[PDB]
Structure formats: structure tokens, C-alpha cells
Amino acid sequence: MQNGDFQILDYTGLISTMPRVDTLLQSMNLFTEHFGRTTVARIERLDDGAGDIKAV
Amino acid sequence: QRGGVRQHLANDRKKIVNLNIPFFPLDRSIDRADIQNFREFGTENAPATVDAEVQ
């Protein structure tokens, strides 16, 4: 390096820093990925149960 | 007091009882109009069938 025009310097390298990023959820494998073909998805649901039986 | 009198016992106890029982029916019927055209739910194009309904 050169300080001004007639003087020299000592160069000590560079310092770098990056921000944090969290990855807790990705480590839990909690989601399942599907690859479709269009921008519409359909889901179907079914319910069932039981009932009473009165005396006869 | 000695010699004079005595005392006696008591003769137990008993009882008897009877009951009745109820009756619980339950029936279910199926017909053609239920399973003719309807899709087998959960499938894209499979037609309905009687066995799924019966089970």
C-alpha cells in the first residue's frame, strides 16, 4: 500500500462478517414435498362414527 | 340370676327376588340407487361397488 503519495503502509488483510440464519424446522423433517404440474390442488376428507342403540 | 329364668334366640332372615332383561335390535338396508353412479370416494375415476358399502 501507499499512504498519501510519498509514504508507505502495512497491510493487515480483510475482515468479513455474515448474519445468522436459523434452520431448526428443516432439521426436524416435519414436512413432505410433492411436485405437481399445475397451480391447483385437491384434497378429500371422510368422516365416520357410531350411534346409540335404544331398548326395544 | 341363677335358677330363676332363661332366655332364647331369634330365627334368622331371608329374601328372594327376580328380574327381567331388555332387547336391543339394530338393522340396516341398502339399495341400487345408493351405489349406481357415485364415484368410489378417494379415487379419481373408480366406480362405486357394493362391497365397500356393506363393510
Side-chain angles (χ1 to χ4, degrees), chain A:
Chain A
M1 272 321 306
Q2 304 183 115
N3 190 1
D5 308 301
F6 309 122
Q7 302 184 91
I8 55 164
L9 285 182
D10 281 288
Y11 183 86
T12 65
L14 179 63
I15 295 293
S16 48
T17 60
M18 295 298 103
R20 268 203 166 212
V21 295
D22 176 45
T23 188
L24 170 59
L25 301 189
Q26 308 197 235
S27 76
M28 311 185 58
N29 293 0
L30 194 61
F31 284 74
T32 56
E33 313 205 283
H34 301 225
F35 306 108
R37 295 198 171 212
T38 195
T39 56
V40 192
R42 164 173 286 165
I43 300 95
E44 292 190 6
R45 172 165 178 157
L46 169 60
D47 296 341
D48 194 19
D52 185 9
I53 308 181
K54 291 202 172 198
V56 166

mmCIF file of all heavy atoms in Angstrom, chain A:
data_model
loop_
_atom_site.group_PDB
_atom_site.id
_atom_site.type_symbol
_atom_site.label_atom_id
_atom_site.label_comp_id
_atom_site.label_asym_id
_atom_site.label_seq_id
_atom_site.Cartn_x
_atom_site.Cartn_y
_atom_site.Cartn_z
ATOM 1 N N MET A 1 0.852 -1.222 0.000
ATOM 2 C CA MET A 1 0.000 0.000 0.000
ATOM 3 C C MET A 1 0.872 1.251 0.000
ATOM 4 O O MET A 1 2.099 1.164 0.010
ATOM 5 C CB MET A 1 -0.932 0.005 1.217
ATOM 6 C CG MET A 1 -2.275 -0.709 1.030
ATOM 7 S SD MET A 1 -3.078 -0.513 -0.577
ATOM 8 C CE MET A 1 -3.129 1.270 -0.733
ATOM 9 N N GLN A 2 0.229 2.416 -0.017
ATOM 10 C CA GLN A 2 0.921 3.695 -0.017
ATOM 11 C C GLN A 2 0.060 4.732 0.686
ATOM 12 O O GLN A 2 -1.062 5.010 0.254
ATOM 13 C CB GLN A 2 1.227 4.166 -1.443
ATOM 14 C CG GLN A 2 2.025 3.179 -2.274
ATOM 15 C CD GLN A 2 2.360 3.723 -3.647
ATOM 16 O OE1 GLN A 2 3.526 3.937 -3.977
ATOM 17 N NE2 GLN A 2 1.334 3.948 -4.460
ATOM 18 N N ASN A 3 0.586 5.305 1.764
ATOM 19 C CA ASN A 3 -0.081 6.399 2.455
ATOM 20 C C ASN A 3 0.214 7.691 1.707
ATOM 21 O O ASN A 3 1.382 8.027 1.479
ATOM 22 C CB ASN A 3 0.381 6.509 3.906
ATOM 23 C CG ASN A 3 -0.456 7.483 4.709
ATOM 24 O OD1 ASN A 3 -1.403 8.075 4.192
ATOM 25 N ND2 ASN A 3 -0.110 7.656 5.979
ATOM 26 N N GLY A 4 -0.836 8.409 1.323
ATOM 27 C CA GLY A 4 -0.624 9.602 0.531
ATOM 28 C C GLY A 4 0.113 9.269 -0.744
ATOM 29 O O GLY A 4 -0.243 8.336 -1.471
ATOM 30 N N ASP A 5 1.165 10.039 -1.022
ATOM 31 C CA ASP A 5 1.966 9.826 -2.219
ATOM 32 C C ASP A 5 3.385 9.375 -1.909
ATOM 33 O O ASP A 5 3.934 8.540 -2.640
ATOM 34 C CB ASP A 5 2.013 11.112 -3.045
ATOM 35 C CG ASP A 5 0.636 11.676 -3.315
ATOM 36 O OD1 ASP A 5 -0.188 10.965 -3.926
ATOM 37 O OD2 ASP A 5 0.374 12.828 -2.911
ATOM 38 N N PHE A 6 3.991 9.901 -0.845
ATOM 39 C CA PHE A 6 5.399 9.672 -0.562
ATOM 40 C C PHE A 6 5.642 8.716 0.599
ATOM 41 O O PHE A 6 6.802 8.511 0.973
ATOM 42 C CB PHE A 6 6.086 11.009 -0.263
ATOM 43 C CG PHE A 6 5.827 12.065 -1.297
ATOM 44 C CD1 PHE A 6 5.246 13.271 -0.944
ATOM 45 C CD2 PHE A 6 6.153 11.851 -2.623
ATOM 46 C CE1 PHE A 6 5.003 14.243 -1.892
ATOM 47 C CE2 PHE A 6 5.913 12.821 -3.576
ATOM 48 C CZ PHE A 6 5.335 14.018 -3.210
ATOM 49 N N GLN A 7 4.595 8.124 1.168
ATOM 50 C CA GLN A 7 4.724 7.278 2.346
ATOM 51 C C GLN A 7 4.123 5.906 2.071
ATOM 52 O O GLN A 7 3.267 5.744 1.197
ATOM 53 C CB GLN A 7 4.045 7.914 3.563
ATOM 54 C CG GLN A 7 4.578 9.291 3.906
ATOM 55 C CD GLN A 7 3.956 9.858 5.164
ATOM 56 O OE1 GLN A 7 4.476 9.673 6.263
ATOM 57 N NE2 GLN A 7 2.835 10.551 5.009
ATOM 58 N N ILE A 8 4.582 4.917 2.835
ATOM 59 C CA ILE A 8 4.153 3.533 2.656
ATOM 60 C C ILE A 8 3.380 3.068 3.885
ATOM 61 O O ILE A 8 3.270 3.801 4.874
ATOM 62 C CB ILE A 8 5.357 2.617 2.373
ATOM 63 C CG1 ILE A 8 6.412 2.757 3.471
ATOM 64 C CG2 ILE A 8 5.961 2.950 1.024
ATOM 65 C CD1 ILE A 8 7.424 1.635 3.479
ATOM 66 N N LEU A 9 2.843 1.850 3.830
ATOM 67 C CA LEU A 9 1.953 1.355 4.870
ATOM 68 C C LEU A 9 2.175 -0.134 5.079
ATOM 69 O O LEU A 9 2.881 -0.795 4.313
ATOM 70 C CB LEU A 9 0.481 1.594 4.519
ATOM 71 C CG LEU A 9 -0.047 3.018 4.662
ATOM 72 C CD1 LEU A 9 -1.529 3.060 4.331
ATOM 73 C CD2 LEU A 9 0.205 3.563 6.061
ATOM 74 N N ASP A 10 1.554 -0.652 6.135
ATOM 75 C CA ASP A 10 1.485 -2.082 6.401
ATOM 76 C C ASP A 10 0.044 -2.535 6.209
ATOM 77 O O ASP A 10 -0.877 -1.940 6.779
ATOM 78 C CB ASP A 10 1.967 -2.396 7.817
ATOM 79 C CG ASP A 10 3.476 -2.400 7.931
ATOM 80 O OD1 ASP A 10 4.111 -3.347 7.422
ATOM 81 O OD2 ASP A 10 4.030 -1.454 8.530
ATOM 82 N N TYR A 11 -0.151 -3.581 5.411
ATOM 83 C CA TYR A 11 -1.482 -4.074 5.073
ATOM 84 C C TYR A 11 -1.744 -5.356 5.857
ATOM 85 O O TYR A 11 -0.931 -6.285 5.822
ATOM 86 C CB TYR A 11 -1.598 -4.323 3.570
ATOM 87 C CG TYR A 11 -2.972 -4.765 3.129
ATOM 88 C CD1 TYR A 11 -3.958 -3.832 2.841
ATOM 89 C CD2 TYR A 11 -3.283 -6.109 2.993
ATOM 90 C CE1 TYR A 11 -5.216 -4.225 2.435
ATOM 91 C CE2 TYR A 11 -4.540 -6.512 2.587
ATOM 92 C CZ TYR A 11 -5.502 -5.566 2.309
ATOM 93 O OH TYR A 11 -6.756 -5.960 1.905
ATOM 94 N N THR A 12 -2.875 -5.400 6.562
ATOM 95 C CA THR A 12 -3.160 -6.466 7.512
ATOM 96 C C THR A 12 -4.308 -7.375 7.089
ATOM 97 O O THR A 12 -4.803 -8.142 7.920
ATOM 98 C CB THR A 12 -3.472 -5.865 8.886
ATOM 99 O OG1 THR A 12 -4.683 -5.104 8.815
ATOM 100 C CG2 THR A 12 -2.336 -4.966 9.346
ATOM 101 N N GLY A 13 -4.748 -7.314 5.834
ATOM 102 C CA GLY A 13 -5.780 -8.224 5.370
ATOM 103 C C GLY A 13 -7.194 -7.683 5.539
ATOM 104 O O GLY A 13 -7.424 -6.523 5.877
ATOM 105 N N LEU A 14 -8.153 -8.573 5.288
ATOM 106 C CA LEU A 14 -9.562 -8.208 5.277
ATOM 107 C C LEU A 14 -10.337 -8.946 6.365
ATOM 108 O O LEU A 14 -9.960 -10.039 6.794
ATOM 109 C CB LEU A 14 -10.172 -8.515 3.911
ATOM 110 C CG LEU A 14 -11.661 -8.206 3.734
ATOM 111 C CD1 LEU A 14 -11.932 -6.718 3.898
ATOM 112 C CD2 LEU A 14 -12.139 -8.698 2.378
ATOM 113 N N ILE A 15 -11.436 -8.331 6.803
ATOM 114 C CA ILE A 15 -12.338 -8.904 7.796
ATOM 115 C C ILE A 15 -13.741 -8.948 7.210
ATOM 116 O O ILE A 15 -14.204 -7.970 6.610
ATOM 117 C CB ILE A 15 -12.325 -8.099 9.112
ATOM 118 C CG1 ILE A 15 -10.955 -8.188 9.784
ATOM 119 C CG2 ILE A 15 -13.411 -8.592 10.046
ATOM 120 C CD1 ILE A 15 -10.595 -9.576 10.298
ATOM 121 N N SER A 16 -14.419 -10.078 7.396
ATOM 122 C CA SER A 16 -15.737 -10.290 6.817
ATOM 123 C C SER A 16 -16.685 -10.824 7.880
ATOM 124 O O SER A 16 -16.266 -11.492 8.828
ATOM 125 C CB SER A 16 -15.675 -11.269 5.642
ATOM 126 O OG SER A 16 -14.930 -12.419 5.999
ATOM 127 N N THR A 17 -17.972 -10.536 7.700
ATOM 128 C CA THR A 17 -18.996 -10.966 8.640
ATOM 129 C C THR A 17 -20.295 -11.218 7.884
ATOM 130 O O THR A 17 -20.630 -10.506 6.936
ATOM 131 C CB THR A 17 -19.220 -9.918 9.736
ATOM 132 O OG1 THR A 17 -19.632 -8.684 9.137
ATOM 133 C CG2 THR A 17 -17.950 -9.684 10.541
ATOM 134 N N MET A 18 -21.050 -12.204 8.354
ATOM 135 C CA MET A 18 -22.306 -12.604 7.736
ATOM 136 C C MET A 18 -23.350 -12.697 8.833
ATOM 137 O O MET A 18 -23.018 -12.946 10.000
ATOM 138 C CB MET A 18 -22.187 -13.960 7.027
ATOM 139 C CG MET A 18 -21.264 -14.075 5.809
ATOM 140 S SD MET A 18 -21.663 -13.054 4.368
ATOM 141 C CE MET A 18 -20.470 -11.723 4.492
ATOM 142 N N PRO A 19 -24.625 -12.521 8.497
ATOM 143 C CA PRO A 19 -25.680 -12.625 9.508
ATOM 144 C C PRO A 19 -26.068 -14.072 9.784
ATOM 145 O O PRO A 19 -25.670 -15.003 9.085
ATOM 146 C CB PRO A 19 -26.840 -11.854 8.877
ATOM 147 C CG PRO A 19 -26.657 -12.067 7.424
ATOM 148 C CD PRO A 19 -25.167 -12.140 7.181
ATOM 149 N N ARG A 20 -26.865 -14.240 10.834
ATOM 150 C CA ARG A 20 -27.350 -15.551 11.231
ATOM 151 C C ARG A 20 -28.519 -16.002 10.362
ATOM 152 O O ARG A 20 -29.300 -15.196 9.848
ATOM 153 C CB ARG A 20 -27.804 -15.543 12.691
ATOM 154 C CG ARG A 20 -26.740 -15.927 13.694
ATOM 155 C CD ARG A 20 -27.389 -16.442 14.969
ATOM 156 N NE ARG A 20 -26.439 -17.125 15.839
ATOM 157 C CZ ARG A 20 -26.745 -18.144 16.632
ATOM 158 N NH1 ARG A 20 -27.980 -18.615 16.713
ATOM 159 N NH2 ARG A 20 -25.788 -18.704 17.366
ATOM 160 N N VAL A 21 -28.634 -17.320 10.211
ATOM 161 C CA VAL A 21 -29.810 -17.954 9.632
ATOM 162 C C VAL A 21 -30.132 -19.188 10.461
ATOM 163 O O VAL A 21 -29.250 -19.990 10.779
ATOM 164 C CB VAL A 21 -29.614 -18.339 8.148
ATOM 165 C CG1 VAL A 21 -29.425 -17.098 7.287
ATOM 166 C CG2 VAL A 21 -28.439 -19.297 7.990
ATOM 167 N N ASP A 22 -31.405 -19.337 10.812
ATOM 168 C CA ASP A 22 -31.849 -20.458 11.630
ATOM 169 C C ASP A 22 -32.405 -21.567 10.749
ATOM 170 O O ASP A 22 -33.060 -21.307 9.736
ATOM 171 C CB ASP A 22 -32.912 -20.013 12.634
ATOM 172 C CG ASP A 22 -33.470 -21.171 13.435
ATOM 173 O OD1 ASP A 22 -32.671 -22.009 13.903
ATOM 174 O OD2 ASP A 22 -34.706 -21.248 13.597
ATOM 175 N N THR A 23 -32.141 -22.813 11.149
ATOM 176 C CA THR A 23 -32.582 -23.984 10.404
ATOM 177 C C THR A 23 -33.219 -25.039 11.298
ATOM 178 O O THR A 23 -33.113 -26.233 10.997
ATOM 179 C CB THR A 23 -31.406 -24.601 9.634
ATOM 180 O OG1 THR A 23 -31.886 -25.632 8.763
ATOM 181 C CG2 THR A 23 -30.375 -25.180 10.596
ATOM 182 N N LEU A 24 -33.882 -24.636 12.383
ATOM 183 C CA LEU A 24 -34.428 -25.607 13.324
ATOM 184 C C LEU A 24 -35.462 -26.505 12.656
ATOM 185 O O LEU A 24 -35.369 -27.734 12.717
ATOM 186 C CB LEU A 24 -35.038 -24.877 14.523
ATOM 187 C CG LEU A 24 -35.853 -25.742 15.485
ATOM 188 C CD1 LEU A 24 -34.995 -26.858 16.052
ATOM 189 C CD2 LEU A 24 -36.429 -24.892 16.601
ATOM 190 N N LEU A 25 -36.457 -25.902 12.000
ATOM 191 C CA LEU A 25 -37.544 -26.695 11.434
ATOM 192 C C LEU A 25 -37.048 -27.648 10.358
ATOM 193 O O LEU A 25 -37.455 -28.815 10.329
ATOM 194 C CB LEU A 25 -38.624 -25.780 10.863
ATOM 195 C CG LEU A 25 -39.274 -24.794 11.835
ATOM 196 C CD1 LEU A 25 -40.468 -24.133 11.174
ATOM 197 C CD2 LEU A 25 -39.686 -25.481 13.125
ATOM 198 N N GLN A 26 -36.171 -27.178 9.469
ATOM 199 C CA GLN A 26 -35.686 -28.040 8.396
ATOM 200 C C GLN A 26 -34.996 -29.276 8.956
ATOM 201 O O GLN A 26 -35.011 -30.340 8.326
ATOM 202 C CB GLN A 26 -34.740 -27.257 7.487
ATOM 203 C CG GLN A 26 -35.321 -25.941 6.988
ATOM 204 C CD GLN A 26 -34.577 -25.385 5.791
ATOM 205 O OE1 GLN A 26 -34.119 -24.242 5.808
ATOM 206 N NE2 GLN A 26 -34.458 -26.188 4.740
ATOM 207 N N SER A 27 -34.393 -29.159 10.138
ATOM 208 C CA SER A 27 -33.732 -30.296 10.762
ATOM 209 C C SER A 27 -34.712 -31.317 11.323
ATOM 210 O O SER A 27 -34.296 -32.438 11.635
ATOM 211 C CB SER A 27 -32.804 -29.810 11.876
ATOM 212 O OG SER A 27 -33.546 -29.434 13.022
ATOM 213 N N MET A 28 -35.988 -30.965 11.464
ATOM 214 C CA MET A 28 -36.980 -31.865 12.038
ATOM 215 C C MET A 28 -37.680 -32.729 10.996
ATOM 216 O O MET A 28 -38.425 -33.639 11.372
ATOM 217 C CB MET A 28 -38.025 -31.060 12.817
ATOM 218 C CG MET A 28 -37.425 -30.045 13.780
ATOM 219 S SD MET A 28 -38.640 -29.200 14.811
ATOM 220 C CE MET A 28 -39.427 -30.580 15.632
ATOM 221 N N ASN A 29 -37.464 -32.473 9.704
ATOM 222 C CA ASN A 29 -38.092 -33.256 8.639
ATOM 223 C C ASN A 29 -39.600 -33.355 8.847
ATOM 224 O O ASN A 29 -40.199 -34.417 8.669
ATOM 225 C CB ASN A 29 -37.475 -34.651 8.544
ATOM 226 C CG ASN A 29 -36.031 -34.618 8.089
ATOM 227 O OD1 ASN A 29 -35.471 -33.551 7.841
ATOM 228 N ND2 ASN A 29 -35.421 -35.791 7.971
ATOM 229 N N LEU A 30 -40.222 -32.240 9.229
ATOM 230 C CA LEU A 30 -41.628 -32.265 9.611
ATOM 231 C C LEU A 30 -42.569 -32.183 8.415
ATOM 232 O O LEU A 30 -43.768 -32.430 8.576
ATOM 233 C CB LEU A 30 -41.913 -31.114 10.576
ATOM 234 C CG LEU A 30 -43.231 -31.170 11.346
ATOM 235 C CD1 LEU A 30 -43.302 -32.413 12.217
ATOM 236 C CD2 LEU A 30 -43.399 -29.918 12.187
ATOM 237 N N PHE A 31 -42.062 -31.853 7.229
ATOM 238 C CA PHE A 31 -42.895 -31.616 6.061
ATOM 239 C C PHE A 31 -42.585 -32.625 4.963
ATOM 240 O O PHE A 31 -41.482 -33.176 4.893
ATOM 241 C CB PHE A 31 -42.695 -30.196 5.522
ATOM 242 C CG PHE A 31 -43.376 -29.140 6.340
ATOM 243 C CD1 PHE A 31 -42.863 -28.756 7.564
ATOM 244 C CD2 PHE A 31 -44.531 -28.532 5.883
ATOM 245 C CE1 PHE A 31 -43.488 -27.785 8.316
ATOM 246 C CE2 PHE A 31 -45.161 -27.560 6.631
ATOM 247 C CZ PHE A 31 -44.639 -27.187 7.850
ATOM 248 N N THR A 32 -43.577 -32.861 4.110
ATOM 249 C CA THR A 32 -43.451 -33.741 2.957
ATOM 250 C C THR A 32 -43.676 -32.943 1.680
ATOM 251 O O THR A 32 -44.619 -32.150 1.593
ATOM 252 C CB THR A 32 -44.458 -34.890 3.031
ATOM 253 O OG1 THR A 32 -45.783 -34.358 3.145
ATOM 254 C CG2 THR A 32 -44.166 -35.774 4.230
ATOM 255 N N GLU A 33 -42.817 -33.162 0.689
ATOM 256 C CA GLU A 33 -42.800 -32.369 -0.532
ATOM 257 C C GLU A 33 -43.390 -33.166 -1.686
ATOM 258 O O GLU A 33 -43.017 -34.324 -1.903
ATOM 259 C CB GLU A 33 -41.375 -31.934 -0.876
ATOM 260 C CG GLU A 33 -40.603 -31.362 0.300
ATOM 261 C CD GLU A 33 -39.500 -30.417 -0.132
ATOM 262 O OE1 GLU A 33 -38.443 -30.902 -0.586
ATOM 263 O OE2 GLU A 33 -39.690 -29.188 -0.019
ATOM 264 N N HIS A 34 -44.308 -32.542 -2.422
ATOM 265 C CA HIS A 34 -44.894 -33.121 -3.621
ATOM 266 C C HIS A 34 -44.690 -32.164 -4.784
ATOM 267 O O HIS A 34 -44.790 -30.945 -4.618
ATOM 268 C CB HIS A 34 -46.393 -33.400 -3.450
ATOM 269 C CG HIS A 34 -46.718 -34.329 -2.323
ATOM 270 N ND1 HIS A 34 -47.615 -35.367 -2.453
ATOM 271 C CD2 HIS A 34 -46.278 -34.371 -1.043
ATOM 272 C CE1 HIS A 34 -47.707 -36.013 -1.305
ATOM 273 N NE2 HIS A 34 -46.907 -35.428 -0.433
ATOM 274 N N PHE A 35 -44.412 -32.718 -5.959
ATOM 275 C CA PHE A 35 -44.191 -31.940 -7.170
ATOM 276 C C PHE A 35 -45.313 -32.235 -8.153
ATOM 277 O O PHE A 35 -45.428 -33.360 -8.649
ATOM 278 C CB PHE A 35 -42.833 -32.269 -7.787
ATOM 279 C CG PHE A 35 -41.687 -32.121 -6.835
ATOM 280 C CD1 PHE A 35 -41.041 -33.235 -6.333
ATOM 281 C CD2 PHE A 35 -41.254 -30.870 -6.442
ATOM 282 C CE1 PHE A 35 -39.987 -33.102 -5.456
ATOM 283 C CE2 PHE A 35 -40.201 -30.730 -5.565
ATOM 284 C CZ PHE A 35 -39.566 -31.849 -5.072
ATOM 285 N N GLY A 36 -46.133 -31.229 -8.433
ATOM 286 C CA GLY A 36 -47.268 -31.367 -9.315
ATOM 287 C C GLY A 36 -46.982 -30.870 -10.717
ATOM 288 O O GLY A 36 -45.834 -30.819 -11.170
ATOM 289 N N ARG A 37 -48.053 -30.501 -11.417
ATOM 290 C CA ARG A 37 -47.958 -29.963 -12.766
ATOM 291 C C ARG A 37 -48.675 -28.637 -12.953
ATOM 292 O O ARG A 37 -48.319 -27.897 -13.878
ATOM 293 C CB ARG A 37 -48.525 -30.961 -13.785
ATOM 294 C CG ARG A 37 -47.745 -32.256 -13.888
ATOM 295 C CD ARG A 37 -48.077 -32.998 -15.170
ATOM 296 N NE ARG A 37 -47.187 -34.131 -15.394
ATOM 297 C CZ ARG A 37 -46.803 -34.568 -16.587
ATOM 298 N NH1 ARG A 37 -47.217 -33.991 -17.703
ATOM 299 N NH2 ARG A 37 -45.982 -35.610 -16.661
ATOM 300 N N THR A 38 -49.660 -28.309 -12.121
ATOM 301 C CA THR A 38 -50.417 -27.076 -12.268
ATOM 302 C C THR A 38 -50.574 -26.418 -10.906
ATOM 303 O O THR A 38 -50.185 -26.969 -9.875
ATOM 304 C CB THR A 38 -51.792 -27.326 -12.900
ATOM 305 O OG1 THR A 38 -52.352 -26.084 -13.341
ATOM 306 C CG2 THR A 38 -52.731 -27.979 -11.898
ATOM 307 N N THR A 39 -51.160 -25.223 -10.919
ATOM 308 C CA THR A 39 -51.277 -24.386 -9.733
ATOM 309 C C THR A 39 -52.556 -24.638 -8.942
ATOM 310 O O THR A 39 -53.022 -23.729 -8.243
ATOM 311 C CB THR A 39 -51.202 -22.911 -10.132
ATOM 312 O OG1 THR A 39 -52.214 -22.621 -11.102
ATOM 313 C CG2 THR A 39 -49.838 -22.587 -10.719
ATOM 314 N N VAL A 40 -53.140 -25.831 -9.032
ATOM 315 C CA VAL A 40 -54.363 -26.162 -8.310
ATOM 316 C C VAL A 40 -54.183 -27.526 -7.658
ATOM 317 O O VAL A 40 -53.621 -28.441 -8.267
ATOM 318 C CB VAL A 40 -55.597 -26.164 -9.231
ATOM 319 C CG1 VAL A 40 -56.873 -26.217 -8.407
ATOM 320 C CG2 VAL A 40 -55.590 -24.937 -10.126
ATOM 321 N N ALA A 41 -54.659 -27.661 -6.421
ATOM 322 C CA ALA A 41 -54.571 -28.908 -5.681
ATOM 323 C C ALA A 41 -55.933 -29.243 -5.096
ATOM 324 O O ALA A 41 -56.709 -28.344 -4.763
ATOM 325 C CB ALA A 41 -53.527 -28.822 -4.564
ATOM 326 N N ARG A 42 -56.216 -30.538 -4.972
ATOM 327 C CA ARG A 42 -57.485 -31.027 -4.454
ATOM 328 C C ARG A 42 -57.233 -32.015 -3.323
ATOM 329 O O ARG A 42 -56.314 -32.836 -3.396
ATOM 330 C CB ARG A 42 -58.309 -31.695 -5.558
ATOM 331 C CG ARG A 42 -59.457 -32.550 -5.050
ATOM 332 C CD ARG A 42 -60.337 -33.046 -6.184
ATOM 333 N NE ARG A 42 -61.187 -31.992 -6.721
ATOM 334 C CZ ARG A 42 -61.838 -32.069 -7.874
ATOM 335 N NH1 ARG A 42 -61.764 -33.144 -8.641
ATOM 336 N NH2 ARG A 42 -62.587 -31.042 -8.266
ATOM 337 N N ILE A 43 -58.056 -31.930 -2.278
ATOM 338 C CA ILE A 43 -57.969 -32.812 -1.120
ATOM 339 C C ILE A 43 -59.372 -33.269 -0.753
ATOM 340 O O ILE A 43 -60.324 -32.482 -0.801
ATOM 341 C CB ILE A 43 -57.295 -32.117 0.080
ATOM 342 C CG1 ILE A 43 -55.878 -31.677 -0.288
ATOM 343 C CG2 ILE A 43 -57.265 -33.046 1.282
ATOM 344 C CD1 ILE A 43 -55.791 -30.244 -0.760
ATOM 345 N N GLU A 44 -59.500 -34.540 -0.379
ATOM 346 C CA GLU A 44 -60.775 -35.133 0.000
ATOM 347 C C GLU A 44 -60.692 -35.678 1.419
ATOM 348 O O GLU A 44 -59.664 -36.230 1.823
ATOM 349 C CB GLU A 44 -61.165 -36.255 -0.965
ATOM 350 C CG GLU A 44 -61.510 -35.775 -2.366
ATOM 351 C CD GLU A 44 -62.118 -36.868 -3.225
ATOM 352 O OE1 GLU A 44 -62.373 -37.970 -2.698
ATOM 353 O OE2 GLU A 44 -62.339 -36.624 -4.430
ATOM 354 N N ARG A 45 -61.783 -35.529 2.169
ATOM 355 C CA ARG A 45 -61.846 -35.951 3.560
ATOM 356 C C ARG A 45 -63.098 -36.782 3.790
ATOM 357 O O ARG A 45 -64.133 -36.549 3.159
ATOM 358 C CB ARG A 45 -61.846 -34.746 4.503
ATOM 359 C CG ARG A 45 -62.093 -35.103 5.955
ATOM 360 C CD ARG A 45 -61.736 -33.951 6.875
ATOM 361 N NE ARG A 45 -62.010 -34.267 8.273
ATOM 362 C CZ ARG A 45 -61.425 -33.674 9.304
ATOM 363 N NH1 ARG A 45 -60.533 -32.715 9.138
ATOM 364 N NH2 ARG A 45 -61.749 -34.056 10.537
ATOM 365 N N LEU A 46 -63.001 -37.748 4.702
ATOM 366 C CA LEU A 46 -64.102 -38.651 5.014
ATOM 367 C C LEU A 46 -64.242 -38.769 6.523
ATOM 368 O O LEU A 46 -63.243 -38.935 7.230
ATOM 369 C CB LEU A 46 -63.871 -40.032 4.391
ATOM 370 C CG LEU A 46 -64.804 -41.157 4.841
ATOM 371 C CD1 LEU A 46 -66.247 -40.814 4.517
ATOM 372 C CD2 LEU A 46 -64.409 -42.467 4.183
ATOM 373 N N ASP A 47 -65.478 -38.690 7.009
ATOM 374 C CA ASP A 47 -65.783 -38.797 8.429
ATOM 375 C C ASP A 47 -66.677 -40.004 8.675
ATOM 376 O O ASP A 47 -67.490 -40.370 7.820
ATOM 377 C CB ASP A 47 -66.479 -37.536 8.945
ATOM 378 C CG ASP A 47 -65.602 -36.307 8.855
ATOM 379 O OD1 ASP A 47 -64.368 -36.465 8.748
ATOM 380 O OD2 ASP A 47 -66.146 -35.184 8.891
ATOM 381 N N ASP A 48 -66.520 -40.619 9.842
ATOM 382 C CA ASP A 48 -67.320 -41.765 10.244
ATOM 383 C C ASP A 48 -67.513 -41.726 11.753
ATOM 384 O O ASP A 48 -66.811 -41.013 12.473
ATOM 385 C CB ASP A 48 -66.659 -43.082 9.815
ATOM 386 C CG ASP A 48 -67.603 -44.264 9.897
ATOM 387 O OD1 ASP A 48 -68.832 -44.043 9.926
ATOM 388 O OD2 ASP A 48 -67.118 -45.413 9.930
ATOM 389 N N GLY A 49 -68.477 -42.497 12.232
ATOM 390 C CA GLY A 49 -68.766 -42.531 13.645
ATOM 391 C C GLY A 49 -69.617 -43.716 14.025
ATOM 392 O O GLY A 49 -69.588 -44.762 13.374
ATOM 393 N N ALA A 50 -70.379 -43.541 15.101
ATOM 394 C CA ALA A 50 -71.253 -44.584 15.616
ATOM 395 C C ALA A 50 -72.521 -43.925 16.138
ATOM 396 O O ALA A 50 -72.715 -42.716 16.002
ATOM 397 C CB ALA A 50 -70.563 -45.404 16.710
ATOM 398 N N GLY A 51 -73.386 -44.740 16.738
ATOM 399 C CA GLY A 51 -74.652 -44.241 17.237
ATOM 400 C C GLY A 51 -75.160 -44.959 18.470
ATOM 401 O O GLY A 51 -74.490 -45.845 19.007
ATOM 402 N N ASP A 52 -76.348 -44.573 18.925
ATOM 403 C CA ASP A 52 -76.954 -45.182 20.098
ATOM 404 C C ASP A 52 -77.818 -46.377 19.699
ATOM 405 O O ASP A 52 -78.238 -46.523 18.549
ATOM 406 C CB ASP A 52 -77.800 -44.154 20.849
ATOM 407 C CG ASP A 52 -78.363 -44.697 22.145
ATOM 408 O OD1 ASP A 52 -77.967 -45.809 22.548
ATOM 409 O OD2 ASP A 52 -79.207 -44.011 22.760
ATOM 410 N N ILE A 53 -78.080 -47.241 20.678
ATOM 411 C CA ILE A 53 -78.957 -48.391 20.492
ATOM 412 C C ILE A 53 -79.939 -48.439 21.653
ATOM 413 O O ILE A 53 -79.589 -48.866 22.759
ATOM 414 C CB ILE A 53 -78.154 -49.701 20.390
ATOM 415 C CG1 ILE A 53 -77.051 -49.566 19.339
ATOM 416 C CG2 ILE A 53 -79.075 -50.861 20.048
ATOM 417 C CD1 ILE A 53 -76.227 -50.822 19.149
ATOM 418 N N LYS A 54 -81.171 -48.000 21.417
ATOM 419 C CA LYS A 54 -82.161 -47.946 22.478
ATOM 420 C C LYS A 54 -82.836 -49.302 22.662
ATOM 421 O O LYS A 54 -82.811 -50.167 21.783
ATOM 422 C CB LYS A 54 -83.209 -46.877 22.178
ATOM 423 C CG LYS A 54 -82.669 -45.463 22.263
ATOM 424 C CD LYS A 54 -83.777 -44.455 22.502
ATOM 425 C CE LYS A 54 -83.213 -43.071 22.778
ATOM 426 N NZ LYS A 54 -84.210 -42.180 23.430
ATOM 427 N N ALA A 55 -83.444 -49.478 23.832
ATOM 428 C CA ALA A 55 -84.136 -50.723 24.134
ATOM 429 C C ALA A 55 -85.409 -50.841 23.305
ATOM 430 O O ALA A 55 -86.048 -49.845 22.960
ATOM 431 C CB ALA A 55 -84.470 -50.798 25.623
ATOM 432 N N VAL A 56 -85.777 -52.079 22.986
ATOM 433 C CA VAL A 56 -86.950 -52.365 22.171
ATOM 434 C C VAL A 56 -87.681 -53.564 22.757
ATOM 435 O O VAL A 56 -87.055 -54.539 23.182
ATOM 436 C CB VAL A 56 -86.567 -52.628 20.701
ATOM 437 C CG1 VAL A 56 -87.727 -53.259 19.949
ATOM 438 C CG2 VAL A 56 -86.132 -51.337 20.031
#
